[PDB]
Amino acid sequence: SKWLDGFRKWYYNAAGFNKLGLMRDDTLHETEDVKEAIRRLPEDLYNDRMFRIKRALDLTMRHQILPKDQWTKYEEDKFYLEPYLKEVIRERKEREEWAKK
Amino acid sequence: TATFAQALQSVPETQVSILDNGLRVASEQSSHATCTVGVWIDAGSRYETEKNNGAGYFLEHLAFKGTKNRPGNALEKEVESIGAHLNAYSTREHTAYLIKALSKDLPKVVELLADIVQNSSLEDSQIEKERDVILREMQENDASMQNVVFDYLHATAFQGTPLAQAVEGPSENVRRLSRTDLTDYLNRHYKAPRMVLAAAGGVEHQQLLDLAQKHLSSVSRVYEEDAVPGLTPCRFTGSEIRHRDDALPLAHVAIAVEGPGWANPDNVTLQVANAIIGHYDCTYGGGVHLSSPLASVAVANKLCQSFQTFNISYSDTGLLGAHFVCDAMSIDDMVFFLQGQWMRLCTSATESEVTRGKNILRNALVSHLDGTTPVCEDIGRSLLTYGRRIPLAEWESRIQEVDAQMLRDICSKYFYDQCPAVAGYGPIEQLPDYNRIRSGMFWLRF
Amino acid sequence: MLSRFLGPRYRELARNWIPTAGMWGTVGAVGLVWATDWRLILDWVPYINGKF
Amino acid sequence: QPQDLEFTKLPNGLVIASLENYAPLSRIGLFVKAGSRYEDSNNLGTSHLLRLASSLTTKGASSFKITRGIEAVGGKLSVTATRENMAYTVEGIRSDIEILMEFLLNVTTAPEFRRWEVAALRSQLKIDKAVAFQNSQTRIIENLHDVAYKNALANPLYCPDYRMGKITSEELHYFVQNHFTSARMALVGLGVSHSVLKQVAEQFLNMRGGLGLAGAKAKYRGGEIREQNGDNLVHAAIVAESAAIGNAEANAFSVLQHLLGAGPHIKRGNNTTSLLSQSVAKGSHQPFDVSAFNASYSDSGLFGIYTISQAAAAGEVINAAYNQVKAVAQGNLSSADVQAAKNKLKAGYLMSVETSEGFLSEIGSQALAAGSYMPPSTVLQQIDSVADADVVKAAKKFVSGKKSMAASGNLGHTPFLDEL
Amino acid sequence: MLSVAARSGPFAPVLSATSRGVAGALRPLLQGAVPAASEPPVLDVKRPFLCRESLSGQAAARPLVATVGLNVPASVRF
């Protein structure tokens, strides 16, 4: 329902990576699949992600967060890494199921 | 429909007959308008006795320079007047003179072949100029660096035997050889019981038999001293040779062990093993997805420029192994990887891997015999080596016998805990010593 | 999370490596009873029963 | 024995040729008129990357699936590109071939052309160009093509060095969607039934019914290029404008190249019946290699002489070869030499289609050009229908035309085009 | 007589190029390998010309004269 959407955006506010200007896909741990999906990114998305990570590192160095009018919000959190990551796990699963037999 | 076995048995049969001179006349027929007719002689570098070490090669040069009835280039003019192609080669065991022509000129070509094996006019001026030509192409073949490592591997693996010497021999023998020595070689080794007249393509077998009875009757048939030149088994030597020239950009290394020869069936199994490891060079367009583990490892780590596996067979002996060219900094790593692959085939070969190697060997055996020249080569070499033409259905039946257990048993028999023969040429100080290469040929975990 | 090795090839590898791993386990057991001088097995053997 | 070759022209312009011969392994090839003829100054080298893009991800199969599935059945995928057309050839054992066909289908119909894969592939095309230009004949022939034509055939087989790192996926997608259309393709199957090819063609060759983009119209300019590289040998190709394919003059020019000498017939031979080799061997006492070059396309042709000689004695070899062609251009020849030239030409043609690859390449080019089978006996009688005056007027058309010269090596004694 | 590569006898593999996307069972003869060649030197980013005012004077009018020195930069003037 819409209760689940409101509860997810409350959890989005409570987790706290929105306060550093980060996206959800920036917070993914850099495994091999994630690193390959970073390598398959276009250059503008790469530069945006690296600047967001560097700015979050600077803000956490100063133990500070952003002013509220440049926080990330639940609606405009675009999921840029999802199709690249989905294709990477589909290709790796295909290679694994080939090598199983 | 038609499955693989039905198409394999639909291939036409090779007809073999024997003349009164012992000449073995074999042919097979297709729908092709052309033909390939050749003479295969059982004469090579293995029959030479260290003082006539380039006699077969120098006759192989002078065979096309004129005969008794066709003096010089007029003979050459004759074959160009029919648009035919004339080729030859000389191995360590076999010599071949083959002609691609049209089928409609089957008689004349056989006549030409006749005097080429029995009426060659060896002239002194031709001897001088072909001595200079042979010196020129040994200088040319010194640049072909994989041929240099091939010769080095044969020398260091067959030390002390007549199978170490090259077909072209040393330079001093080229500088000093005389017409009497060539006459002795041709009187000793160009007799009719060792010759196979092979024909492939749109040629009638009875017509070729009539031509061989007309022309190639009474070639030699006589030893003239009752002295049969018999072949003797050659000792294999686990050894290393290191030609070091750091000015070269790339290094070639060939590693080998014994293989059983021509007339032992597990060669087929060994062929499957090579089909597992395969070949690669830098222009293959597969990427990081090649089926060979060594190829994928060498692509990912950027080790090789090329690698290539081989099985080489002579009379109850042979060389089985690999050969690679790479830069200096890669060499040691690849040796480790290469030996690991062999040990995997000795220990933990699977069934899909064996099936892939079997399909690769099926495609190699069938697609190699496309056209009359390789079919004629297979006919002549098979009558000289196996004593018969092995049909491709027999090859398919022997390939189907291969499963994983007998393959890793055979690979453990021929690779595991065996002393290799290593030849190298180039910047090869990262190529390890013989002790580490020998220690890499077994696993401490089995 | 060990579901990558559920196939016929890994079973083939397993039945290839049964006898070598079993023989290595036999080596380990014989070396352990040899080094420890364990009295359970060394009383079951003919020639080594000389010091007891 | 097989039955005769079977043809089908689908309504979207696709030609289908099939031969049922019950071969142990089958050969399937798709022939597309999408060579390097069809590029211009902005997308140079797109055909070189498209040549190496045969193992990338499509829809229906990934790169891993294509490579592992073709290598698992032991089959082979290759592609051969000439300056006018490309040919994608798969082969494999008969009981597998249908799955191989759909792989070729994907490679020829719907490439994905992702950006990261072509960014990986551009280094491979640099390495492939280096391997190809390791020998000197390829370099001098590509230079000769760049000098002889001003458009549409000066585009080389290999990508230029500035374009590497700059070919994007959009140029490949544009090239495929403008040149890989169904009215310019031929599907040829040796060792497969006609119904299988017709079923696969009706399944997934129904997307691009147009004739594509065409009409490049290569023009001739002439001139010379002189690559000084200081080698001990000097290579030199001197050509001129000659007739295209579709003419009896093309047969006359083939008879002319086999009359003057068109390569070796004897291992370590002297080329005695070659006229050019006879003239130069009467002249020069040093090793050489003179032959006749004839590249005939569908719109224009190049005919000339190709000489390899020593660095200092290059002028004598080149002038002797040119004067030999001048002497045979003035009627000074013998009919027995023309008959031997015809025999050489027909023997080379019958030996070309002797193997399965040459036969499939010949029938792919015939289906692309005319769409109908030319039997070998008709080719032989068309060779036999050439007079001596046709060869004389072909050599006269060579000698009176403005030449394109490409030279490579130590050119201190090599002449210029004003001194031939 | 089609197959434009086979029209030329010895110049069949020179007019054509045959890549192999999936290499088959039989290896080609003369596999071939690039030598480890050198690398060009690195240079700074140059001056682009995006207006008529910058392009003025760039057209050459005099023969090329080069100048080297022990402690002065190398120059070329046209």
UniProtKB/Swiss-Prot annotation, chain B:
Matches recorded under Gene3D superfamilies: Metalloenzyme, LuxS/M16 peptidase-like
Phenotype of null mutants: Results in early embryonic lethality.
BP terms from Gene Ontology: cellular respiration; mitochondrial electron transport, ubiquinol to cytochrome c; mitochondrial respiratory chain complex III assembly; response to activity; response to alkaloid
UniProt entry keywords in alphabetical sequence: Acetylation, Electron transport, Membrane, Mitochondrion, Mitochondrion inner membrane, Phosphoprotein, Respiratory chain, Transit peptide, Transport
Residue numbers bearing the N6-succinyllysine modification: 129
A single MF term (Gene Ontology): protein-containing complex binding
Residue numbers bearing the N6-acetyllysine modification: 77, 104, 129, 214
Residue list for modification Phosphoserine: 178
Membrane topology per record: Peripheral membrane protein
Superkingdom: Eukaryota
Localization in the cell: Mitochondrion inner membrane
UniProt entry tagged with the keyword Mitochondrion: yes
Pfam families: Peptidase_M16 (PF00675), Peptidase_M16_C (PF05193)
Modified residues (Phosphothreonine): 180
Any one of the GO CC terms: mitochondrion
Family per record: Belongs to the peptidase M16 family. UQCRC1/QCR1 subfamily.
PANTHER family membership: CYTOCHROME B-C1 COMPLEX SUBUNIT 1, MITOCHONDRIAL (PTHR11851:SF116), METALLOPROTEASE (PTHR11851)
Protein name: Cytochrome b-c1 complex subunit 1, mitochondrial
Species whose genome carries this gene: Mus musculus
Originating gene: Uqcrc1
Curated annotation (Swiss-Prot), chain C:
Function (record text): Component of the ubiquinol-cytochrome c oxidoreductase, a multisubunit transmembrane complex that is part of the mitochondrial electron transport chain which drives oxidative phosphorylation.
KW Membrane (keyword) present: yes
Record key words, sorted: Electron transport, Membrane, Mitochondrion, Mitochondrion inner membrane, Respiratory chain, Transmembrane, Transmembrane helix, Transport
The protein's name: Cytochrome b-c1 complex subunit 10
GO CC terms in record: mitochondrial inner membrane; mitochondrion; respiratory chain complex III
Compartmental location: Mitochondrion inner membrane
GO terms of biological process kind: cellular respiration; mitochondrial electron transport, ubiquinol to cytochrome c
Natural source organism: Mus musculus (Mouse)
Gene: Uqcr11
Primary localisation category: mitochondrion
Family: Belongs to the UQCR11/QCR10 family.
Curated annotation (Swiss-Prot), chain D:
Residues carrying N6-acetyllysine: 33, 166, 217
Entry-linked PANTHER family: CYTOCHROME B-C1 COMPLEX SUBUNIT 2, MITOCHONDRIAL, METALLOPROTEASE
Pfam families reported in the protein's UniProt record: Peptidase_M16, Peptidase_M16_C
GO biological process: cellular respiration; mitochondrial electron transport, ubiquinol to cytochrome c; proteolysis; response to xenobiotic stimulus
Sequence similarity: Belongs to the peptidase M16 family. UQCRC2/QCR2 subfamily.
Modified sites of kind Phosphoserine: 335
Membrane association type: Peripheral membrane protein
Entry protein name: Cytochrome b-c1 complex subunit 2, mitochondrial
Assembly and binders: Component of the ubiquinol-cytochrome c oxidoreductase (cytochrome b-c1 complex, complex III, CIII), a multisubunit enzyme composed of 11 subunits. The complex is composed of 3 respiratory subunits cytochrome b, cytochrome c1 and Rieske protein UQCRFS1, 2 core protein subunits UQCRC1/QCR1 and UQCRC2/QCR2, and 6 low-molecular weight protein subunits UQCRH/QCR6, UQCRB/QCR7, UQCRQ/QCR8, UQCR10/QCR9, UQCR11/QCR10 and subunit 9, the cleavage product of Rieske protein UQCRFS1.
Processing and modification events after translation: Acetylation of Lys-126 and Lys-217 is observed in liver mitochondria from fasted mice but not from fed mice.
GO CC annotation terms, alphabetical: mitochondrial inner membrane; mitochondrion; myelin sheath; nucleoplasm; respiratory chain complex III
Cellular compartments annotated: Mitochondrion inner membrane
Organism: Mus musculus (Mouse)
Cross-referenced InterPro entries: Metalloenz_LuxS/M16 (IPR011249), MPP/UQCRC_Complex (IPR050361), Pept_M16_N (IPR011765), Pept_M16_Zn_BS (IPR001431), Peptidase_M16_C (IPR007863)
From Swiss-Prot, chain E:
Cited function: Component of the ubiquinol-cytochrome c oxidoreductase (cytochrome b-c1 complex, complex III, CIII). UQCRFS1 undergoes proteolytic processing once it is incorporated in the complex III dimer. One of the fragments, called subunit 9, corresponds to its mitochondrial targeting sequence (MTS). The proteolytic processing is necessary for the correct insertion of UQCRFS1 in the complex III dimer, but the persistence of UQCRFS1-derived fragments may prevent newly imported UQCRFS1 to be processed and assembled into complex III and is detrimental for the complex III structure and function.
Interval of the full protein contained in this chain: 1 to 78 of 274
Name of the molecule in the record: Cytochrome b-c1 complex subunit 9
Provenance organism: Mus musculus
Quaternary structure (record): Component of the ubiquinol-cytochrome c oxidoreductase (cytochrome b-c1 complex, complex III, CIII). Subunit 9 corresponds to the mitochondrial targeting sequence (MTS) of Rieske protein UQCRFS1. It is retained after processing and incorporated inside complex III, where it remains bound to the complex and localizes between the 2 core subunits UQCRC1/QCR1 and UQCRC2/QCR2.
Superkingdom as given in the UniProt entry: Eukaryota
